[PDB]
Amino acid sequence: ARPCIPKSFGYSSVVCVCNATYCDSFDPPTFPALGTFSRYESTRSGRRMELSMGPIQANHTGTGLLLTLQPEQKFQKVKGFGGAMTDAAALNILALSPPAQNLLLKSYFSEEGIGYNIIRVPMASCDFSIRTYTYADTPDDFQLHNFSLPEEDTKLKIPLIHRALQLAQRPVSLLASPWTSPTWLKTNGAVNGKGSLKGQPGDIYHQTWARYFVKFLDAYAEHKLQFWAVTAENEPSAGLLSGYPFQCLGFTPEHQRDFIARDLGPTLANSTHHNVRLLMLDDQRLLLPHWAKVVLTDPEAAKYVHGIAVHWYLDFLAPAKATLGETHRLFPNTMLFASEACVGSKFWEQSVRLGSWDRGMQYSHSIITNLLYHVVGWTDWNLALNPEGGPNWVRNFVDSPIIVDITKDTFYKQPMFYHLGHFSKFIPEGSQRVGLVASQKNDLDAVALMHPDGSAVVVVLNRSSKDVPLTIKDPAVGFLETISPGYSIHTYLWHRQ
Numbered sequence: 001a002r003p004c005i006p007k008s009f010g011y012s013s014v015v016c017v018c019n020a021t022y023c024d025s026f027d028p029p030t031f032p033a034l035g036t037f038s039r040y041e042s043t044r045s046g047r048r049m050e051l052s053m054g055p056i057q058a059n060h061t062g063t064g065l066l067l068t069l070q071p072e073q074k075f076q077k078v079k080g081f082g083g084a085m086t087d088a089a090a091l092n093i094l095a096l097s098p099p100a101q102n103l104l105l106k107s108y109f110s111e112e113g114i115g116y117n118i119i120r121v122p123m124a125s126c127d128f129s130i131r132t133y134t135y136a137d138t139p140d141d142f143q144l145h146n147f148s149l150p151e152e153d154t155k156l157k158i159p160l161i162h163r164a165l166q167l168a169q170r171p172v173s174l175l176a177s178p179w180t181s182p183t184w185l186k187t188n189g190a191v192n193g194k195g196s197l198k199g200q201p202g203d204i205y206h207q208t209w210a211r212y213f214v215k216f217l218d219a220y221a222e223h224k225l226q227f228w229a230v231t232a233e234n235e236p237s238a239g240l241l242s243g244y245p246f247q248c249l250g251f252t253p254e255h256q257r258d259f260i261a262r263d264l265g266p267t268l269a270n271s272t273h274h275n276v277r278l279l280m281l282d283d284q285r286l287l288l289p290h291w292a293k294v295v296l297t298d299p300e301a302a303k304y305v306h307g308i309a310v311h312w313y314l315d316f317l318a319p320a321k322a323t324l325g326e327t328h329r330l331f332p333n334t335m336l337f338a339s340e341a342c343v344g345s346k347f348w349e350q351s352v353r354l355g356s357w358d359r360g361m362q363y364s365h366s367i368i369t370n371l372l373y374h375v376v377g378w379t380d381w382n383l384a385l386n387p388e389g390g391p392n393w394v395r396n397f398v399d400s401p402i403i404v405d406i407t408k409d410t411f412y413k414q415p416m417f418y419h420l421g422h423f424s425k426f427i428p429e430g431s432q433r434v435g436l437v438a439s440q441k442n443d444l445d446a447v448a449l450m451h452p453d454g455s456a457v458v459v460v461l462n463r464s465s466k467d468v469p470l471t472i473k474d475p476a477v478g479f480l481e482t483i484s485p486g487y488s489i490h491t492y493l494w495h496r497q
């Protein structure tokens with residue numbers, strides 16, 4: 001339909017400019033006959049998921065790298081891709097005029113955008129809020145009679161979620177994570193800093209906190225929203241660090257184990273929301289496999305845990321094989337799910353870099369690595385931020401695939417938006433990762449999957465400056481002759497039948 005309006009802000013590539021009356025979008029998906037492939041291409045030089053087609057031929061013209069599909073080697077099935085409807089994201093979106101808001105939401109959730117099917121929802125406030133609050137700040141309310149949803153939920157988050165779901169083609173799954181409990185449940189009486197639940201698993205504080213999960217699910221269900229899963233705590237390890245600056249609730253692995261076993265698991269099971277899944281960890285994968293060993297070798301905890309949620313912030317010092325791979329080896333029937341990523345929260349990282357191709361590459365590289373190590377899904381952090389990377393009440397300003405400049409009723413789609421979209425748009429839920437064999441050492445990152453209808457999708461990322469000639473072989477169709485340019489990402493799709 002409408003192409004990208006490029007704009008440069010002095011970094012390595014361009015953003016795409018959208019306003020109240022214009023945003024770049026796709027035509028409805030349409031895919032060609034057997035023997036033809038579809039290629040979507042994004043480049044640092046400015047191409048943004050541009051579509052072209054070509055032949056899959058019986059003859060093998062290329063003499064360079066060959067990537068050979070191996071559809072009989074089957075791995076994990078995919079849950080999906082998405083981002084977080086934080087307070088900061090919803091404030092930025094709702095400060096656009098309504099027509100602009102819809103172009104933003106369609107960008108993420110529609111088939112004319114990139115088909116997100118996962119939304120992470122914080123349970124009350126986190127750093128990406130403009131104030132500190134929980135749903136039950138009234139102290140010594142252990143039956144949670146004064147549990148209530150504030151304006152952030154009822155006015156910002158929930159209406160936007162409702163609109164995302166209306167616009168979405170695919171069913172969207174909601175995932176909830178709490179940052180802090182009511183402070184009168186905490187050893188330190190504060191929203192942040194080093195503190196855990198008071199007492200011990202099974203007691204009144206732990207039972208009240210588990211009841212808080214049910215109260216949250218009831219509240220959202222009253223607004224006609226139901227959750228696929230919750231996490232046992234966002235970044236539980238952070239709450240063990242002296243002086244941690246934002247909302248946290250510390251658990252040791254043993255404390256998470258016992259809380260799930262004694263309190264959260266049974267309470268969820270004894271509730272009308274017993275079908276909601278429980279994900280453990282929700283933290284840096286450096287904590288793996290140890291956290292998995294502690295929780296999952298206890299059968300009274302393990303029976304309640306559906307999967308393990310990981311954050312990407314320490315991926316660089318923890319190789320995937322030693323963490324995701326060793327965890328899948330030890331517990332092959334517990335899914336791994338990437339529940340949060342963002343660029344710009346480390347020091348030295350300037351918060352927002354509009355047009356940064358480098359930060360787009362970081363996203364796709366991470367997604368490819370996750371997929372090659374059994375991860376079933378990948379979830380961005382804030383869906384939208386302002387040009388400073390906020391709001392954020394502790395000024396932990398970070399980057400986001402969409403940056404909203406409300407003073408101009410304008411938002412910018414970063415290279416991160418398109419690098420994610422090379423996956424989210426073309427790997428529907430239930431797709432299965434299959435083998436892809438490289439014929440020789442190379443600089444590319446690639447992954448192959450099969451849609452539920454048996455058709456093929458391959459993503460090829462080139463992080464090097466050099467053009468790499470490439471052949472992709474499907475044993476049942478033939479040879480796809482192409483080139484992966486320097487600083488590019490491609491998604492290929494083709495029927496196999």
Ligand SMILES: O[C@@H]1[C@H](O)CN[C@@H]1Cn1cc(-c2cc(Cl)cc(Cl)c2)nn1
Pocket residue numbers: 126127128234235246284313314340345346381396
């Ligand atoms: O704002 C987000 C929510 O509060 C939850 N995750 C975000 C907060 N957060 C955590 C980190 C972090 C970064 C490194 Cl490098 C190592 C470690 Cl252990 C942690 N960065 N940002």
Ligand SMILES: *[C@@H]1O[C@H](CO)[C@@H](O)[C@H](O)[C@H]1NC(C)=O
Pocket residue numbers: 005018019020021022
């Ligand atoms: C909106 O977007 C289009 C696309 O560049 C542009 O022609 C138009 O001037 C923009 N401005 C406003 C105020 O809508």
Ligand code: NA
Pocket residue numbers: 007008009010011012013014015354355356
């Ligand atoms: Na730029």
Ligand code: NA
Pocket residue numbers: 066067068437438439
């Ligand atoms: Na090969």
Ligand code: NA
Pocket residue numbers: 085086087088122124125126128129
């Ligand atoms: Na929030």
Ligand code: NA
Pocket residue numbers: 122123124125152153
């Ligand atoms: Na909230």
Ligand code: NA
Pocket residue numbers: 131132133
């Ligand atoms: Na406050």
Ligand code: NA
Pocket residue numbers: 134135136137138146147148149
């Ligand atoms: Na309340």
Ligand code: NA
Pocket residue numbers: 172173174175226227228229
């Ligand atoms: Na859901």
Ligand code: NA
Pocket residue numbers: 122123124125126178179180181247
């Ligand atoms: Na919270």
Ligand code: NA
Pocket residue numbers: 123124125134135178179180181182
């Ligand atoms: Na909370």
Ligand code: NA
Pocket residue numbers: 283284285286311312313314315316318
């Ligand atoms: Na990590």
Ligand code: NA
Pocket residue numbers: 341342343381382383385398399400
């Ligand atoms: Na973000």
Ligand code: NA
Pocket residue numbers: 082083084380381382383384401
């Ligand atoms: Na996002």
Ligand code: NA
Pocket residue numbers: 451453455
């Ligand atoms: Na299809």
Ligand code: NA
Pocket residue numbers: 443444445461462463464
């Ligand atoms: Na690469």
